[PDB]
């Protein structure tokens, strides 16, 4: 923001924000997959109990 | 529709645009970042010089 003027800083911040949002989406998707796996594991554990 | 008129130097016309920096764009006439419209300029040496 300090070293670039608003026009180009806009697209630079848009690049950064797209990257970070995609990274967070990937993290949450992997977390959902792991949560489904752990749900299956917990169901098996309850059946065993 | 709003029509704003004025006279400036030749290369100084480059400051007439959204989000620009300079004497004019900062202390005389600043266009908004979301400006939609047109900027029309023509030489006036036969009139104002």
PDB file of N, CA and C in Angstrom:
ATOM      1  N   UNK A   1       0.818  -1.208   0.000  1.00  0.00           N
ATOM      2  CA  UNK A   1       0.000   0.000   0.000  1.00  0.00           C
ATOM      3  C   UNK A   1       0.854   1.260   0.000  1.00  0.00           C
ATOM      4  N   UNK A   2       1.995   1.234   0.687  1.00  0.00           N
ATOM      5  CA  UNK A   2       2.829   2.422   0.817  1.00  0.00           C
ATOM      6  C   UNK A   2       3.671   2.673  -0.429  1.00  0.00           C
ATOM      7  N   UNK A   3       4.128   1.610  -1.090  1.00  0.00           N
ATOM      8  CA  UNK A   3       5.050   1.759  -2.208  1.00  0.00           C
ATOM      9  C   UNK A   3       4.374   1.681  -3.571  1.00  0.00           C
ATOM     10  N   UNK A   4       3.067   1.422  -3.641  1.00  0.00           N
ATOM     11  CA  UNK A   4       2.366   1.432  -4.918  1.00  0.00           C
ATOM     12  C   UNK A   4       1.133   2.320  -4.837  1.00  0.00           C
ATOM     13  N   UNK A   5       0.827   2.975  -5.957  1.00  0.00           N
ATOM     14  CA  UNK A   5      -0.319   3.862  -6.028  1.00  0.00           C
ATOM     15  C   UNK A   5      -1.612   3.049  -6.097  1.00  0.00           C
ATOM     16  N   UNK A   6      -2.747   3.671  -5.785  1.00  0.00           N
ATOM     17  CA  UNK A   6      -3.998   2.913  -5.606  1.00  0.00           C
ATOM     18  C   UNK A   6      -4.300   2.004  -6.786  1.00  0.00           C
ATOM     19  N   UNK A   7      -4.165   2.483  -8.029  1.00  0.00           N
ATOM     20  CA  UNK A   7      -4.548   1.622  -9.166  1.00  0.00           C
ATOM     21  C   UNK A   7      -3.854   0.268  -9.172  1.00  0.00           C
ATOM     22  N   UNK A   8      -2.520   0.246  -9.111  1.00  0.00           N
ATOM     23  CA  UNK A   8      -1.794  -1.021  -9.152  1.00  0.00           C
ATOM     24  C   UNK A   8      -1.826  -1.742  -7.811  1.00  0.00           C
ATOM     25  N   UNK A   9      -1.844  -0.993  -6.706  1.00  0.00           N
ATOM     26  CA  UNK A   9      -1.983  -1.617  -5.398  1.00  0.00           C
ATOM     27  C   UNK A   9      -3.281  -2.406  -5.311  1.00  0.00           C
ATOM     28  N   UNK A  10      -4.320  -1.954  -6.014  1.00  0.00           N
ATOM     29  CA  UNK A  10      -5.581  -2.686  -6.011  1.00  0.00           C
ATOM     30  C   UNK A  10      -5.399  -4.090  -6.569  1.00  0.00           C
ATOM     31  N   UNK A  11      -4.771  -4.209  -7.739  1.00  0.00           N
ATOM     32  CA  UNK A  11      -4.594  -5.528  -8.336  1.00  0.00           C
ATOM     33  C   UNK A  11      -3.584  -6.356  -7.545  1.00  0.00           C
ATOM     34  N   UNK A  12      -2.579  -5.718  -6.939  1.00  0.00           N
ATOM     35  CA  UNK A  12      -1.637  -6.472  -6.115  1.00  0.00           C
ATOM     36  C   UNK A  12      -2.331  -7.065  -4.891  1.00  0.00           C
ATOM     37  N   UNK A  13      -3.132  -6.255  -4.197  1.00  0.00           N
ATOM     38  CA  UNK A  13      -3.869  -6.747  -3.040  1.00  0.00           C
ATOM     39  C   UNK A  13      -4.895  -7.784  -3.469  1.00  0.00           C
ATOM     40  N   UNK A  14      -5.468  -7.631  -4.666  1.00  0.00           N
ATOM     41  CA  UNK A  14      -6.389  -8.644  -5.168  1.00  0.00           C
ATOM     42  C   UNK A  14      -5.678  -9.970  -5.395  1.00  0.00           C
ATOM     43  N   UNK A  15      -4.468  -9.931  -5.952  1.00  0.00           N
ATOM     44  CA  UNK A  15      -3.669 -11.144  -6.096  1.00  0.00           C
ATOM     45  C   UNK A  15      -3.422 -11.794  -4.740  1.00  0.00           C
ATOM     46  N   UNK A  16      -2.922 -11.012  -3.780  1.00  0.00           N
ATOM     47  CA  UNK A  16      -2.641 -11.554  -2.452  1.00  0.00           C
ATOM     48  C   UNK A  16      -3.895 -12.153  -1.826  1.00  0.00           C
ATOM     49  N   UNK A  17      -5.033 -11.472  -1.979  1.00  0.00           N
ATOM     50  CA  UNK A  17      -6.256 -11.896  -1.309  1.00  0.00           C
ATOM     51  C   UNK A  17      -6.812 -13.150  -1.965  1.00  0.00           C
ATOM     52  N   UNK A  18      -6.765 -13.223  -3.295  1.00  0.00           N
ATOM     53  CA  UNK A  18      -7.158 -14.451  -3.975  1.00  0.00           C
ATOM     54  C   UNK A  18      -6.296 -15.618  -3.518  1.00  0.00           C
ATOM     55  N   UNK A  19      -4.979 -15.418  -3.457  1.00  0.00           N
ATOM     56  CA  UNK A  19      -4.106 -16.486  -2.997  1.00  0.00           C
ATOM     57  C   UNK A  19      -4.443 -16.945  -1.591  1.00  0.00           C
ATOM     58  N   UNK A  20      -4.620 -15.993  -0.671  1.00  0.00           N
ATOM     59  CA  UNK A  20      -4.872 -16.351   0.721  1.00  0.00           C
ATOM     60  C   UNK A  20      -6.237 -17.012   0.886  1.00  0.00           C
ATOM     61  N   UNK A  21      -7.248 -16.525   0.163  1.00  0.00           N
ATOM     62  CA  UNK A  21      -8.572 -17.131   0.242  1.00  0.00           C
ATOM     63  C   UNK A  21      -8.558 -18.547  -0.314  1.00  0.00           C
ATOM     64  N   UNK A  22      -7.846 -18.767  -1.422  1.00  0.00           N
ATOM     65  CA  UNK A  22      -7.730 -20.119  -1.956  1.00  0.00           C
ATOM     66  C   UNK A  22      -6.980 -21.032  -0.995  1.00  0.00           C
ATOM     67  N   UNK A  23      -5.947 -20.515  -0.326  1.00  0.00           N
ATOM     68  CA  UNK A  23      -5.224 -21.322   0.651  1.00  0.00           C
ATOM     69  C   UNK A  23      -6.131 -21.707   1.815  1.00  0.00           C
ATOM     70  N   UNK A  24      -6.926 -20.754   2.305  1.00  0.00           N
ATOM     71  CA  UNK A  24      -7.846 -21.054   3.399  1.00  0.00           C
ATOM     72  C   UNK A  24      -8.909 -22.056   2.964  1.00  0.00           C
ATOM     73  N   UNK A  25      -9.400 -21.931   1.728  1.00  0.00           N
ATOM     74  CA  UNK A  25     -10.372 -22.893   1.219  1.00  0.00           C
ATOM     75  C   UNK A  25      -9.768 -24.289   1.139  1.00  0.00           C
ATOM     76  N   UNK A  26      -8.524 -24.391   0.666  1.00  0.00           N
ATOM     77  CA  UNK A  26      -7.849 -25.684   0.626  1.00  0.00           C
ATOM     78  C   UNK A  26      -7.701 -26.263   2.028  1.00  0.00           C
ATOM     79  N   UNK A  27      -7.297 -25.424   2.984  1.00  0.00           N
ATOM     80  CA  UNK A  27      -7.156 -25.885   4.362  1.00  0.00           C
ATOM     81  C   UNK A  27      -8.476 -26.426   4.892  1.00  0.00           C
ATOM     82  N   UNK A  28      -9.570 -25.700   4.652  1.00  0.00           N
ATOM     83  CA  UNK A  28     -10.859 -26.122   5.189  1.00  0.00           C
ATOM     84  C   UNK A  28     -11.363 -27.373   4.480  1.00  0.00           C
ATOM     85  N   UNK A  29     -11.055 -27.534   3.192  1.00  0.00           N
ATOM     86  CA  UNK A  29     -11.451 -28.754   2.495  1.00  0.00           C
ATOM     87  C   UNK A  29     -10.700 -29.965   3.041  1.00  0.00           C
ATOM     88  N   UNK A  30      -9.386 -29.832   3.232  1.00  0.00           N
ATOM     89  CA  UNK A  30      -8.624 -30.919   3.838  1.00  0.00           C
ATOM     90  C   UNK A  30      -9.124 -31.210   5.248  1.00  0.00           C
ATOM     91  N   UNK A  31      -9.505 -30.165   5.986  1.00  0.00           N
ATOM     92  CA  UNK A  31     -10.044 -30.362   7.326  1.00  0.00           C
ATOM     93  C   UNK A  31     -11.365 -31.116   7.279  1.00  0.00           C
ATOM     94  N   UNK A  32     -12.209 -30.817   6.288  1.00  0.00           N
ATOM     95  CA  UNK A  32     -13.465 -31.545   6.141  1.00  0.00           C
ATOM     96  C   UNK A  32     -13.213 -33.014   5.826  1.00  0.00           C
ATOM     97  N   UNK A  33     -12.243 -33.293   4.955  1.00  0.00           N
ATOM     98  CA  UNK A  33     -11.926 -34.683   4.625  1.00  0.00           C
ATOM     99  C   UNK A  33     -11.436 -35.420   5.869  1.00  0.00           C
ATOM    100  N   UNK A  34     -10.511 -34.803   6.608  1.00  0.00           N
ATOM    101  CA  UNK A  34     -10.011 -35.425   7.830  1.00  0.00           C
ATOM    102  C   UNK A  34     -11.120 -35.596   8.861  1.00  0.00           C
ATOM    103  N   UNK A  35     -12.067 -34.656   8.913  1.00  0.00           N
ATOM    104  CA  UNK A  35     -13.169 -34.763   9.860  1.00  0.00           C
ATOM    105  C   UNK A  35     -14.099 -35.909   9.491  1.00  0.00           C
ATOM    106  N   UNK A  36     -14.323 -36.129   8.195  1.00  0.00           N
ATOM    107  CA  UNK A  36     -15.107 -37.289   7.779  1.00  0.00           C
ATOM    108  C   UNK A  36     -14.394 -38.588   8.141  1.00  0.00           C
ATOM    109  N   UNK A  37     -13.080 -38.643   7.909  1.00  0.00           N
ATOM    110  CA  UNK A  37     -12.319 -39.827   8.299  1.00  0.00           C
ATOM    111  C   UNK A  37     -12.433 -40.082   9.800  1.00  0.00           C
ATOM    112  N   UNK A  38     -12.306 -39.027  10.607  1.00  0.00           N
ATOM    113  CA  UNK A  38     -12.369 -39.193  12.055  1.00  0.00           C
ATOM    114  C   UNK A  38     -13.789 -39.518  12.501  1.00  0.00           C
ATOM    115  N   UNK A  39     -14.800 -39.059  11.760  1.00  0.00           N
ATOM    116  CA  UNK A  39     -16.172 -39.467  12.045  1.00  0.00           C
ATOM    117  C   UNK A  39     -16.342 -40.965  11.837  1.00  0.00           C
ATOM    118  N   UNK A  40     -15.809 -41.490  10.733  1.00  0.00           N
ATOM    119  CA  UNK A  40     -15.846 -42.934  10.522  1.00  0.00           C
ATOM    120  C   UNK A  40     -15.115 -43.667  11.642  1.00  0.00           C
ATOM    121  N   UNK A  41     -13.939 -43.163  12.027  1.00  0.00           N
ATOM    122  CA  UNK A  41     -13.180 -43.794  13.103  1.00  0.00           C
ATOM    123  C   UNK A  41     -13.962 -43.785  14.412  1.00  0.00           C
ATOM    124  N   UNK A  42     -14.643 -42.677  14.713  1.00  0.00           N
ATOM    125  CA  UNK A  42     -15.403 -42.583  15.955  1.00  0.00           C
ATOM    126  C   UNK A  42     -16.621 -43.494  15.925  1.00  0.00           C
ATOM    127  N   UNK A  43     -17.258 -43.634  14.761  1.00  0.00           N
ATOM    128  CA  UNK A  43     -18.350 -44.594  14.640  1.00  0.00           C
ATOM    129  C   UNK A  43     -17.856 -46.009  14.911  1.00  0.00           C
ATOM    130  N   UNK A  44     -16.709 -46.373  14.332  1.00  0.00           N
ATOM    131  CA  UNK A  44     -16.137 -47.688  14.605  1.00  0.00           C
ATOM    132  C   UNK A  44     -15.818 -47.850  16.087  1.00  0.00           C
ATOM    133  N   UNK A  45     -15.292 -46.797  16.717  1.00  0.00           N
ATOM    134  CA  UNK A  45     -14.949 -46.874  18.133  1.00  0.00           C
ATOM    135  C   UNK A  45     -16.192 -47.052  18.996  1.00  0.00           C
ATOM    136  N   UNK A  46     -17.284 -46.369  18.651  1.00  0.00           N
ATOM    137  CA  UNK A  46     -18.523 -46.530  19.404  1.00  0.00           C
ATOM    138  C   UNK A  46     -19.094 -47.931  19.224  1.00  0.00           C
ATOM    139  N   UNK A  47     -19.044 -48.458  17.997  1.00  0.00           N
ATOM    140  CA  UNK A  47     -19.474 -49.834  17.775  1.00  0.00           C
ATOM    141  C   UNK A  47     -18.651 -50.803  18.614  1.00  0.00           C
ATOM    142  N   UNK A  48     -17.329 -50.613  18.641  1.00  0.00           N
ATOM    143  CA  UNK A  48     -16.471 -51.465  19.458  1.00  0.00           C
ATOM    144  C   UNK A  48     -16.839 -51.363  20.931  1.00  0.00           C
ATOM    145  N   UNK A  49     -16.959 -50.140  21.450  1.00  0.00           N
ATOM    146  CA  UNK A  49     -17.405 -49.956  22.826  1.00  0.00           C
ATOM    147  C   UNK A  49     -18.653 -50.782  23.101  1.00  0.00           C
TER     148      UNK A  49
ATOM    149  N   UNK B   1     -25.688  13.717 -15.388  1.00  0.00           N
ATOM    150  CA  UNK B   1     -24.409  13.982 -16.034  1.00  0.00           C
ATOM    151  C   UNK B   1     -23.855  15.290 -15.488  1.00  0.00           C
ATOM    152  N   UNK B   2     -22.572  15.281 -15.134  1.00  0.00           N
ATOM    153  CA  UNK B   2     -21.875  16.463 -14.645  1.00  0.00           C
ATOM    154  C   UNK B   2     -20.661  16.720 -15.525  1.00  0.00           C
ATOM    155  N   UNK B   3     -20.542  17.946 -16.022  1.00  0.00           N
ATOM    156  CA  UNK B   3     -19.439  18.350 -16.885  1.00  0.00           C
ATOM    157  C   UNK B   3     -18.560  19.337 -16.130  1.00  0.00           C
ATOM    158  N   UNK B   4     -17.303  18.960 -15.911  1.00  0.00           N
ATOM    159  CA  UNK B   4     -16.325  19.799 -15.230  1.00  0.00           C
ATOM    160  C   UNK B   4     -15.277  20.235 -16.244  1.00  0.00           C
ATOM    161  N   UNK B   5     -14.997  21.536 -16.288  1.00  0.00           N
ATOM    162  CA  UNK B   5     -14.120  22.118 -17.295  1.00  0.00           C
ATOM    163  C   UNK B   5     -12.995  22.887 -16.621  1.00  0.00           C
ATOM    164  N   UNK B   6     -11.814  22.862 -17.235  1.00  0.00           N
ATOM    165  CA  UNK B   6     -10.671  23.621 -16.746  1.00  0.00           C
ATOM    166  C   UNK B   6      -9.531  23.482 -17.746  1.00  0.00           C
ATOM    167  N   UNK B   7      -8.460  24.236 -17.501  1.00  0.00           N
ATOM    168  CA  UNK B   7      -7.285  24.257 -18.363  1.00  0.00           C
ATOM    169  C   UNK B   7      -6.063  23.892 -17.532  1.00  0.00           C
ATOM    170  N   UNK B   8      -5.158  23.112 -18.127  1.00  0.00           N
ATOM    171  CA  UNK B   8      -3.947  22.645 -17.463  1.00  0.00           C
ATOM    172  C   UNK B   8      -2.833  22.533 -18.497  1.00  0.00           C
ATOM    173  N   UNK B   9      -1.641  22.178 -18.020  1.00  0.00           N
ATOM    174  CA  UNK B   9      -0.501  21.982 -18.903  1.00  0.00           C
ATOM    175  C   UNK B   9      -0.753  20.787 -19.824  1.00  0.00           C
ATOM    176  N   UNK B  10       0.209  20.524 -20.706  1.00  0.00           N
ATOM    177  CA  UNK B  10       0.076  19.446 -21.667  1.00  0.00           C
ATOM    178  C   UNK B  10       0.254  18.068 -21.065  1.00  0.00           C
ATOM    179  N   UNK B  11       1.468  17.759 -20.602  1.00  0.00           N
ATOM    180  CA  UNK B  11       1.711  16.462 -19.980  1.00  0.00           C
ATOM    181  C   UNK B  11       1.031  16.345 -18.624  1.00  0.00           C
ATOM    182  N   UNK B  12       0.657  17.471 -18.014  1.00  0.00           N
ATOM    183  CA  UNK B  12      -0.067  17.436 -16.750  1.00  0.00           C
ATOM    184  C   UNK B  12      -1.429  16.772 -16.890  1.00  0.00           C
ATOM    185  N   UNK B  13      -1.934  16.629 -18.119  1.00  0.00           N
ATOM    186  CA  UNK B  13      -3.211  15.961 -18.333  1.00  0.00           C
ATOM    187  C   UNK B  13      -3.157  14.508 -17.889  1.00  0.00           C
ATOM    188  N   UNK B  14      -1.960  13.922 -17.814  1.00  0.00           N
ATOM    189  CA  UNK B  14      -1.829  12.551 -17.335  1.00  0.00           C
ATOM    190  C   UNK B  14      -2.312  12.397 -15.901  1.00  0.00           C
ATOM    191  N   UNK B  15      -2.361  13.487 -15.133  1.00  0.00           N
ATOM    192  CA  UNK B  15      -2.852  13.439 -13.763  1.00  0.00           C
ATOM    193  C   UNK B  15      -4.372  13.395 -13.681  1.00  0.00           C
ATOM    194  N   UNK B  16      -5.073  13.640 -14.787  1.00  0.00           N
ATOM    195  CA  UNK B  16      -6.531  13.613 -14.797  1.00  0.00           C
ATOM    196  C   UNK B  16      -6.992  12.187 -15.056  1.00  0.00           C
ATOM    197  N   UNK B  17      -7.085  11.391 -13.996  1.00  0.00           N
ATOM    198  CA  UNK B  17      -7.511  10.004 -14.098  1.00  0.00           C
ATOM    199  C   UNK B  17      -7.761   9.476 -12.693  1.00  0.00           C
ATOM    200  N   UNK B  18      -8.478   8.361 -12.560  1.00  0.00           N
ATOM    201  CA  UNK B  18      -8.800   7.852 -11.220  1.00  0.00           C
ATOM    202  C   UNK B  18      -7.551   7.423 -10.462  1.00  0.00           C
ATOM    203  N   UNK B  19      -7.478   7.828  -9.196  1.00  0.00           N
ATOM    204  CA  UNK B  19      -6.419   7.367  -8.319  1.00  0.00           C
ATOM    205  C   UNK B  19      -5.022   7.784  -8.715  1.00  0.00           C
ATOM    206  N   UNK B  20      -4.863   8.954  -9.324  1.00  0.00           N
ATOM    207  CA  UNK B  20      -3.546   9.443  -9.701  1.00  0.00           C
ATOM    208  C   UNK B  20      -2.962  10.316  -8.592  1.00  0.00           C
ATOM    209  N   UNK B  21      -1.659  10.572  -8.696  1.00  0.00           N
ATOM    210  CA  UNK B  21      -0.937  11.389  -7.732  1.00  0.00           C
ATOM    211  C   UNK B  21      -0.240  12.530  -8.455  1.00  0.00           C
ATOM    212  N   UNK B  22      -0.189  13.678  -7.795  1.00  0.00           N
ATOM    213  CA  UNK B  22       0.433  14.851  -8.371  1.00  0.00           C
ATOM    214  C   UNK B  22      -0.223  16.109  -7.837  1.00  0.00           C
ATOM    215  N   UNK B  23       0.363  17.246  -8.219  1.00  0.00           N
ATOM    216  CA  UNK B  23      -0.157  18.531  -7.763  1.00  0.00           C
ATOM    217  C   UNK B  23      -1.646  18.662  -8.059  1.00  0.00           C
ATOM    218  N   UNK B  24      -2.032  18.532  -9.330  1.00  0.00           N
ATOM    219  CA  UNK B  24      -3.439  18.662  -9.697  1.00  0.00           C
ATOM    220  C   UNK B  24      -4.268  17.588  -9.005  1.00  0.00           C
ATOM    221  N   UNK B  25      -3.964  16.319  -9.281  1.00  0.00           N
ATOM    222  CA  UNK B  25      -4.764  15.210  -8.776  1.00  0.00           C
ATOM    223  C   UNK B  25      -4.866  15.181  -7.257  1.00  0.00           C
ATOM    224  N   UNK B  26      -4.054  15.958  -6.542  1.00  0.00           N
ATOM    225  CA  UNK B  26      -4.048  15.930  -5.087  1.00  0.00           C
ATOM    226  C   UNK B  26      -4.552  17.208  -4.433  1.00  0.00           C
ATOM    227  N   UNK B  27      -4.476  18.363  -5.104  1.00  0.00           N
ATOM    228  CA  UNK B  27      -4.849  19.622  -4.469  1.00  0.00           C
ATOM    229  C   UNK B  27      -5.765  20.493  -5.323  1.00  0.00           C
ATOM    230  N   UNK B  28      -6.045  20.108  -6.569  1.00  0.00           N
ATOM    231  CA  UNK B  28      -6.875  20.935  -7.439  1.00  0.00           C
ATOM    232  C   UNK B  28      -8.135  20.200  -7.880  1.00  0.00           C
ATOM    233  N   UNK B  29      -7.980  18.967  -8.366  1.00  0.00           N
ATOM    234  CA  UNK B  29      -9.113  18.219  -8.909  1.00  0.00           C
ATOM    235  C   UNK B  29      -8.749  16.735  -8.865  1.00  0.00           C
ATOM    236  N   UNK B  30      -9.463  15.978  -8.036  1.00  0.00           N
ATOM    237  CA  UNK B  30      -9.215  14.554  -7.846  1.00  0.00           C
ATOM    238  C   UNK B  30     -10.440  13.769  -8.298  1.00  0.00           C
ATOM    239  N   UNK B  31     -10.224  12.785  -9.168  1.00  0.00           N
ATOM    240  CA  UNK B  31     -11.311  11.929  -9.620  1.00  0.00           C
ATOM    241  C   UNK B  31     -11.472  10.742  -8.669  1.00  0.00           C
ATOM    242  N   UNK B  32     -12.696  10.265  -8.452  1.00  0.00           N
ATOM    243  CA  UNK B  32     -12.888   9.128  -7.548  1.00  0.00           C
ATOM    244  C   UNK B  32     -12.324   7.843  -8.134  1.00  0.00           C
ATOM    245  N   UNK B  33     -12.054   6.888  -7.240  1.00  0.00           N
ATOM    246  CA  UNK B  33     -11.497   5.611  -7.672  1.00  0.00           C
ATOM    247  C   UNK B  33     -12.471   4.842  -8.554  1.00  0.00           C
ATOM    248  N   UNK B  34     -13.771   4.943  -8.277  1.00  0.00           N
ATOM    249  CA  UNK B  34     -14.803   4.274  -9.060  1.00  0.00           C
ATOM    250  C   UNK B  34     -15.393   5.188 -10.129  1.00  0.00           C
ATOM    251  N   UNK B  35     -14.592   6.113 -10.653  1.00  0.00           N
ATOM    252  CA  UNK B  35     -15.083   7.064 -11.642  1.00  0.00           C
ATOM    253  C   UNK B  35     -15.526   6.348 -12.909  1.00  0.00           C
ATOM    254  N   UNK B  36     -16.723   6.690 -13.380  1.00  0.00           N
ATOM    255  CA  UNK B  36     -17.221   6.240 -14.670  1.00  0.00           C
ATOM    256  C   UNK B  36     -17.661   7.458 -15.470  1.00  0.00           C
ATOM    257  N   UNK B  37     -17.085   7.615 -16.652  1.00  0.00           N
ATOM    258  CA  UNK B  37     -17.330   8.765 -17.488  1.00  0.00           C
ATOM    259  C   UNK B  37     -16.275   8.860 -18.567  1.00  0.00           C
ATOM    260  N   UNK B  38     -15.906  10.093 -18.909  1.00  0.00           N
ATOM    261  CA  UNK B  38     -14.924  10.337 -19.953  1.00  0.00           C
ATOM    262  C   UNK B  38     -14.137  11.600 -19.640  1.00  0.00           C
ATOM    263  N   UNK B  39     -12.881  11.612 -20.079  1.00  0.00           N
ATOM    264  CA  UNK B  39     -11.996  12.764 -19.957  1.00  0.00           C
ATOM    265  C   UNK B  39     -11.596  13.184 -21.365  1.00  0.00           C
ATOM    266  N   UNK B  40     -11.968  14.404 -21.747  1.00  0.00           N
ATOM    267  CA  UNK B  40     -11.727  14.927 -23.085  1.00  0.00           C
ATOM    268  C   UNK B  40     -10.796  16.125 -22.969  1.00  0.00           C
ATOM    269  N   UNK B  41      -9.751  16.143 -23.796  1.00  0.00           N
ATOM    270  CA  UNK B  41      -8.753  17.201 -23.768  1.00  0.00           C
ATOM    271  C   UNK B  41      -8.358  17.567 -25.190  1.00  0.00           C
ATOM    272  N   UNK B  42      -8.033  18.842 -25.395  1.00  0.00           N
ATOM    273  CA  UNK B  42      -7.575  19.331 -26.688  1.00  0.00           C
ATOM    274  C   UNK B  42      -6.662  20.529 -26.475  1.00  0.00           C
ATOM    275  N   UNK B  43      -5.725  20.709 -27.401  1.00  0.00           N
ATOM    276  CA  UNK B  43      -4.775  21.809 -27.303  1.00  0.00           C
ATOM    277  C   UNK B  43      -5.497  23.147 -27.412  1.00  0.00           C
ATOM    278  N   UNK B  44      -4.966  24.154 -26.713  1.00  0.00           N
ATOM    279  CA  UNK B  44      -5.562  25.485 -26.701  1.00  0.00           C
ATOM    280  C   UNK B  44      -4.504  26.571 -26.861  1.00  0.00           C
ATOM    281  N   UNK B  45      -3.470  26.308 -27.664  1.00  0.00           N
ATOM    282  CA  UNK B  45      -2.437  27.314 -27.886  1.00  0.00           C
ATOM    283  C   UNK B  45      -2.960  28.480 -28.713  1.00  0.00           C
ATOM    284  N   UNK B  46      -3.907  28.223 -29.617  1.00  0.00           N
ATOM    285  CA  UNK B  46      -4.486  29.284 -30.428  1.00  0.00           C
ATOM    286  C   UNK B  46      -5.465  30.152 -29.649  1.00  0.00           C
ATOM    287  N   UNK B  47      -5.791  29.787 -28.408  1.00  0.00           N
ATOM    288  CA  UNK B  47      -6.784  30.509 -27.620  1.00  0.00           C
ATOM    289  C   UNK B  47      -6.192  31.117 -26.356  1.00  0.00           C
ATOM    290  N   UNK B  48      -5.488  30.333 -25.539  1.00  0.00           N
ATOM    291  CA  UNK B  48      -5.121  30.763 -24.195  1.00  0.00           C
ATOM    292  C   UNK B  48      -3.686  31.252 -24.067  1.00  0.00           C
ATOM    293  N   UNK B  49      -2.817  30.947 -25.027  1.00  0.00           N
ATOM    294  CA  UNK B  49      -1.405  31.272 -24.891  1.00  0.00           C
ATOM    295  C   UNK B  49      -1.139  32.732 -25.239  1.00  0.00           C
TER     296      UNK B  49
END
